Motif scaffolding. Structure first.
Motif, mmCIF file in Angstrom:
data_model
loop_
_atom_site.group_PDB
_atom_site.id
_atom_site.type_symbol
_atom_site.label_atom_id
_atom_site.label_comp_id
_atom_site.label_asym_id
_atom_site.label_seq_id
_atom_site.Cartn_x
_atom_site.Cartn_y
_atom_site.Cartn_z
ATOM 1 N N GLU A 194 3.207 1.805 -2.985
ATOM 2 C CA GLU A 194 2.276 2.228 -4.037
ATOM 3 C C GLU A 194 1.806 3.674 -3.802
ATOM 4 O O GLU A 194 1.714 4.445 -4.750
ATOM 5 C CB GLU A 194 1.124 1.232 -4.101
ATOM 6 C CG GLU A 194 -0.104 1.586 -4.945
ATOM 7 C CD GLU A 194 0.098 1.287 -6.445
ATOM 8 O OE1 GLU A 194 1.076 1.789 -7.051
ATOM 9 O OE2 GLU A 194 -0.731 0.550 -7.035
ATOM 10 N N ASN A 195 1.586 4.083 -2.547
ATOM 11 C CA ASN A 195 1.267 5.464 -2.165
ATOM 12 C C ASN A 195 2.399 6.427 -2.537
ATOM 13 O O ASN A 195 2.144 7.468 -3.132
ATOM 14 C CB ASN A 195 0.898 5.560 -0.680
ATOM 15 C CG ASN A 195 -0.224 6.546 -0.405
ATOM 16 O OD1 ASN A 195 -0.166 7.714 -0.763
ATOM 17 N ND2 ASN A 195 -1.287 6.114 0.236
ATOM 18 N N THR A 208 4.566 5.837 -4.980
ATOM 19 C CA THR A 208 4.575 5.848 -6.435
ATOM 20 C C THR A 208 3.423 6.677 -7.006
ATOM 21 O O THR A 208 3.633 7.443 -7.939
ATOM 22 C CB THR A 208 4.531 4.386 -6.876
ATOM 23 O OG1 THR A 208 5.839 3.856 -6.930
ATOM 24 C CG2 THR A 208 3.858 4.152 -8.216
ATOM 25 N N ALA A 209 2.220 6.588 -6.442
ATOM 26 C CA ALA A 209 1.062 7.345 -6.916
ATOM 27 C C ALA A 209 1.158 8.831 -6.549
ATOM 28 O O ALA A 209 0.884 9.686 -7.386
ATOM 29 C CB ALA A 209 -0.216 6.739 -6.325
ATOM 30 N N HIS A 210 1.598 9.147 -5.331
ATOM 31 C CA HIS A 210 1.946 10.491 -4.886
ATOM 32 C C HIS A 210 3.230 11.000 -5.576
ATOM 33 O O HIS A 210 3.400 12.204 -5.712
ATOM 34 C CB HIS A 210 1.795 10.553 -3.360
ATOM 35 C CG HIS A 210 1.225 11.849 -2.848
ATOM 36 N ND1 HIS A 210 -0.113 12.145 -2.708
ATOM 37 C CD2 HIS A 210 1.920 12.922 -2.377
ATOM 38 C CE1 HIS A 210 -0.220 13.359 -2.142
ATOM 39 N NE2 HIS A 210 1.000 13.874 -1.910
ATOM 40 N N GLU A 211 4.085 10.133 -6.139
ATOM 41 C CA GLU A 211 5.188 10.551 -7.010
ATOM 42 C C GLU A 211 4.663 10.859 -8.414
ATOM 43 O O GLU A 211 5.066 11.859 -8.981
ATOM 44 C CB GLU A 211 6.325 9.541 -7.221
ATOM 45 C CG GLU A 211 7.363 9.520 -6.104
ATOM 46 C CD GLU A 211 8.753 9.060 -6.596
ATOM 47 O OE1 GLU A 211 9.438 9.834 -7.305
ATOM 48 O OE2 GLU A 211 9.195 7.941 -6.233
ATOM 49 N N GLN A 212 3.771 10.051 -9.001
ATOM 50 C CA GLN A 212 3.158 10.344 -10.302
ATOM 51 C C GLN A 212 2.260 11.581 -10.224
ATOM 52 O O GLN A 212 2.245 12.400 -11.138
ATOM 53 C CB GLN A 212 2.405 9.135 -10.833
ATOM 54 C CG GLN A 212 3.372 8.029 -11.273
ATOM 55 C CD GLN A 212 2.679 6.890 -12.022
ATOM 56 O OE1 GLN A 212 1.541 6.520 -11.763
ATOM 57 N NE2 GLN A 212 3.338 6.284 -12.990
ATOM 58 N N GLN A 213 1.556 11.781 -9.110
ATOM 59 C CA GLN A 213 0.869 13.039 -8.830
ATOM 60 C C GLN A 213 1.884 14.163 -8.624
ATOM 61 O O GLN A 213 1.542 15.314 -8.864
ATOM 62 C CB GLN A 213 -0.032 12.902 -7.597
ATOM 63 C CG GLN A 213 -1.429 12.399 -7.977
ATOM 64 C CD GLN A 213 -2.040 11.477 -6.918
ATOM 65 O OE1 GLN A 213 -1.931 11.686 -5.714
ATOM 66 N NE2 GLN A 213 -2.719 10.420 -7.317
ATOM 67 N N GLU A 223 0.814 -1.226 0.000
ATOM 68 C CA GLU A 223 0.000 0.000 0.000
ATOM 69 C C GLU A 223 0.847 1.274 0.000
ATOM 70 O O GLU A 223 0.605 2.155 -0.816
ATOM 71 C CB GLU A 223 -0.954 -0.098 1.215
ATOM 72 C CG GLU A 223 -1.355 1.183 1.960
ATOM 73 C CD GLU A 223 -2.065 2.236 1.081
ATOM 74 O OE1 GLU A 223 -3.019 1.877 0.347
ATOM 75 O OE2 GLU A 223 -1.697 3.435 1.148
ATOM 76 N N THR A 231 3.144 14.862 -12.245
ATOM 77 C CA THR A 231 2.004 15.556 -12.776
ATOM 78 C C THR A 231 1.921 16.920 -12.145
ATOM 79 O O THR A 231 1.717 17.839 -12.900
ATOM 80 C CB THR A 231 0.724 14.761 -12.583
ATOM 81 O OG1 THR A 231 0.811 13.554 -13.307
ATOM 82 C CG2 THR A 231 -0.482 15.494 -13.112
#
Length: 107
Positions: free
Chosen positions: A42-43, A45-50, A39, A53
């Motif tokens: 992945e958080n 990675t997703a907060h890195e892609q955000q 989790e 972005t």
């Protein structure tokens, strides 16, 4: 049965002392500490892609002061750049949650 035996044991020897222990032990636990890794990594990675972005959203706000340079499209930059600062604060604190997490995925 249909047979017989002649087994036995010798007398004891003068070695009196500690001869018993309590070393009995067992271990087992749920994987939840690394379910949290899966989790939180992945958080990251997703907060890195955000965060990439948020870099890309601040470049789209630079693209706004490009097209219509009102003092707001430049302040709107500092706002998109403020999400990069949100995101960057997170990822230092997040990558550090991982350095604590990860150092317990070991256990």
């Amino acid at each position: 049965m249909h047979h017989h035996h002649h087994h036995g044991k010798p007398i004891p020897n003068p070695l009196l002392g500690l001869d018993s222990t309590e070393n009995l032990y067992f271990q087992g636990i749920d994987p939840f500490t690394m379910s949290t890794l899966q989790e939180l990594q992945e958080n990251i990675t997703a907060h890195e892609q955000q965060l990439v972005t948020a870099r890309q959203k601040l470049k789209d706000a630079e693209k706004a002061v490009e097209v219509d340079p009102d003092d707001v499209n430049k302040s709107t930059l500092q706002n998109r750049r403020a999400a990069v600062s949100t995101l960057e604060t997170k990822l230092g604190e997040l990558k550090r949650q991982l350095a604590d997490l990860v150092a317990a995925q070991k256990l």
